[PDB]
């Protein structure tokens, strides 16, 4: 309600954070980071088991994910093992780098929001004290300063840092799926049976964060 909303406080916090962030990230970089965050929040990463099932279902014959779309299209084009390896590792590194940079953008935002809140609360306290003949009606004058501090804390702890953490988790999942799809495409190019590759495909599915799931 109207006690928790202040135009000047949100303006100070948002403008200061945007200024400081644009001192290290261009507008295109920030927009790409927001696009990556929206993709990671509104879309679900493909299940590795479903990916393995799709790989083994399409292996014996010789389509939803774009990575395996590109893989099968380029294999149809008929390139070499060095070509497929180079292109797929390049795509993996590219995706990892943009995810890391989006994490950096949102972490810079989360680090700079509470400093802007401190600046805003200092401005509010100065404004309160400059008009204090008697300490009677200074409650609402302090409310705006604590409001700027609260805005900084909320944006830092409940918005920007969770977005960065979700981007990190999405980067991990995307890297795992990319490695799985690369291995499947290499196996299909070689022409092995579907059963032999599945023996080692899921050996390292318990890597890192998933180690607690067993």
């Amino acid at each position: 309600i109207g006690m928790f909303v202040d135009v000047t406080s949100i303006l100070i916090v948002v403008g200061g954070s945007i200024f400081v962030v644009l001192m290290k990230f261009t507008m295109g970089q920030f927009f790409g980071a927001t696009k990556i965050a929206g993709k990671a929040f509104m879309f679900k990463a493909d299940e590795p088991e479903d990916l393995i099932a799709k790989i083994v279902e399409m292996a014996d014959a010789a389509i939803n994910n774009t990575f395996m779309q590109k893989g099968i299209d380029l294999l149809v084009d008929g390139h070499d093992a060095d070509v497929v390896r180079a292109a797929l590792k390049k795509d993996i590194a590219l995706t990892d780098e943009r995810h890391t940079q989006g994490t950096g953008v949102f972490r810079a935002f989360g680090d700079v929001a509470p400093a802007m809140g401190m600046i805003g609360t200092l401005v509010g306290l100065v404004a309160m004290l400059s008009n204090m003949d008697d300490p009677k009606a200074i409650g609402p004058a302090m409310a705006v300063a604590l409001l700027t501090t609260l805005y900084g804390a909320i944006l830092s702890n409940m918005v920007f840092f969770p977005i960065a953490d979700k981007l990190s988790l999405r980067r991990d999942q995307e890297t795992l799926n990319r490695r799985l799809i690369m291995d499947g495409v290499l196996a299909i190019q070689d022409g092995q049976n579907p059963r032999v590759i599945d023996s080692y495909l899921k050996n390292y599915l318990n890597e890192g964060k998933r180690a607690l799931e067993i």
């Binding site: 509470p114 400093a115 306290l125 300490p135």
Partner: protein, 46 residues
């Protein structure tokens, strides 16, 4: 650790708390208002 803005926030908050204690030292509190506040706080805390 913790960011240094938190330390500046703590230092400023304690400093101004000292100032407000000084302000209360030479101020007389209303008795009826204090009784109302005390009753409300007791009710809220259970």
């Amino acid at each position: 650790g913790l960011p240094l803005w938190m330390g500046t926030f703590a230092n400023l908050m304690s400093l101004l708390m000292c100032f407000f204690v000084l302000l209360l030292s030479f101020s007389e509190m209303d008795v009826l208002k204090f009784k109302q506040i005390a009753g409300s706080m007791k009710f809220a805390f259970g």
